[PDB]
Design a protein around this ligand. Structure first.
Ligand code: A1IP1
Lengths: 257, 262
């Protein structure tokens, strides 16, 4: 099964490149620099934010920018999930349920790729918004961005590359412990294959990184907690800013979550 | 080093037996019918069980409250049992003392829930080292917030027990939980995470030899650490609500002090 696990890993990696326009490899080339052609404009305060629009309330506009980018990410993640062998053959309600509960943990996973300790890439890498600027936004929005950075700094220390992340993201989607699943067994058979592939992938690509398989699964705990914290913060904003709306796609994902 | 992982797994199993009074093998013998426990299924059988089983905690006059405090007394007892087991984990007593205190403080709740599953099935829970059995439906039916306090434990236990782990599996799993290097306030994470790498290596090999047919059981067991963290968080939120709604939690100040941890 070893050669079929390698074939499954190449399949998923190839599909991840096709589905996500900004990879971790591209994001690290922009973040670490040296290059004169990939250099981002940096947003660190109110005035340079206003200059960024000419080149590429404030807290709200940034919030709506995050929602709009999240809708794009849900669309990209949905297109990747279809490529996972077995996913589109599942019962439809379960396809919806796996995506409903899975997209957010994946967005946080992939957002780490665009992050370092000092900020996050934006607008397909043309921009860079600093952590301290986000932390400083008013009333509840300042505390909205920061727990993402806290996760990303820890998660990025695993030094995963895209070919690892492709299998990991798939493992997250095919969780048989999601609420309301009708057919757990066919979902868990798919995940066992993906976990076998991830185990072998991490062993070949990080032969010196002892127990990286176990350490990566333990991060699914930290993802689950940041999603719950996030949802609790949305509930507060939806009750404080009554003149502010959500995309239908995001509205549906959060209903009874 | 294969032989050293097997040695570490046996060491932990031997210590797990000495530290915990009622093993999973023994509890499973009682639950399935394979000596016969007193059964609490309603209000009147509860009143007979205390007069017969001589619970170590009988002094509030209310039924739901007394069961809740009984859960608290047993958890304080279990905390001491877990603390003694942790001392036997190779490397644990050589850690900085504050970090030993920090790992136990944040780990006992996850371990109490994990080991409580061993005493549960879908129909109830064993009590008093297996002399009693309290039905799930009786616990489910307790009034106001207390009925919904007991049921999420059964829900977890039913899923967790579907993994069919035994005591030698659990001895290593419990050690892995104690050695979490991501607890808040740790001073020296490196030696904690080094020990956990050893324990994870032992747990991985144990599950392959003891469950050669259960594919990716290692992965599936680690995925349950997600479910443990989430239920501990909900549990804390339910205590705060009981402490703020229930003026009839009258305990002797000395008793409140004993129980301040849970
Ligand atoms: C009839 C009589 C004499 C009145 O007695 C009782 O009615 N009971 C006493 C005997 C029995 C106690 O059960 C456990 C036995 C053991 C054990 O053996 O290893 C271990 C755990 C419990 C137990 N803990 N726990 C908690 O809530 C809990 C938890 Cl998980 C983690 C951390 C802190 C707490 C705290 F601090 F908050 F409690 C329960 C909630 C629901 C049920 Cl069903 C079990 C637990 C059932 C109650």
């Amino acid at each position: 099964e070893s050669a079929d696990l390698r074939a499954l890993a190449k399949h998923l990696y190839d599909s991840y490149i096709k589905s996500f326009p900004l990879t971790k490899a591209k994001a690290r080339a922009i973040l670490t620099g040296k290059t004169t052609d990939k250099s981002p404009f940096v947003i660190y305060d109110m005035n340079s934010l206003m200059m960024g629009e000419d080149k590429i309330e404030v807290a709200i506009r940034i919030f709506q920018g995050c929602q709009f980018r999240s809708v794009e990410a849900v669309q990209e993640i949905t297109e990747y999930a279809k490529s996972i062998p077995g996913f589109v053959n599942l019962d439809l309600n379960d396809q919806v349920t796996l995506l409903k509960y899975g997209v957010h943990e994946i967005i946080y996973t992939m957002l780490a790729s665009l992050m370092n300790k000092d900020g996050v890439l934006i607008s397909e890498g043309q921009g860079f918004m600093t952590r301290e600027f986000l932390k400083s936004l008013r009333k509840p929005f300042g505390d909205f961005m920061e727990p993402k950075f806290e996760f990303a700094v820890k998660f990025n220390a695993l030094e995963l590359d895209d070919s690892d992340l492709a299998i990991f993201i798939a493992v997250i989607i095919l969780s048989g412990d999601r609420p309301g699943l009708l057919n757990v067994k066919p979902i868990e058979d798919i995940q066992d294959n993906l976990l076998q592939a991830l185990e072998l992938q991490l062993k070949l690509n990080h032969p010196e990184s002892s127990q990286l398989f176990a350490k990566l699964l333990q991060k699914m705990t930290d993802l689950r907690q940041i999603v719950t914290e996030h949802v609790q913060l949305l509930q507060v904003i939806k009750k404080t800013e009554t003149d502010m709306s959500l995309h239908p796609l995001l509205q549906e994902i959060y209903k009874d979550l």
